[PDB]
Design a protein that fits this description.
The chain contains two helices and two strands. With 88 residues, it is mostly helical.
Length: 88
């Protein structure tokens, strides 16, 4: 249990993706909060077909190789580490 053990606090958010602009895919699980939550932390979310300027990207990068190919584990590990961790 990650989210339920992390975002279980309303949104906790925390200074995780601090300035971490990861492209949160709509196909990603927990997207609901994944979006608001993340960006809510203090970062930003770019639409797949919209990253060129983006910074991070959830699963995959193509749309934006200049972003970060982070996953759902990164958000937790990050928000949990109160500091952006190794994106993968």
């Amino acid at each position: 249990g990650s989210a339920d053990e992390t975002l279980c606090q309303t949104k906790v958010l925390l200074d995780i993706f601090t300035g971490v602009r990861l492209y949160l895919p709509p196909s990603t699980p927990d997207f609901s909060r994944l979006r608001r939550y993340f960006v809510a932390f203090d970062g930003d979310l770019v639409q797949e077909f919209d990253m060129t300027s983006a910074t991070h990207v959830l699963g995959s990068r193509d749309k934006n190789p200049a972003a970060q190919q982070v996953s759902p584990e990164w958000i937790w590990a990050c928000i949990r580490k109160r500091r952006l961790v190794a994106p993968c």
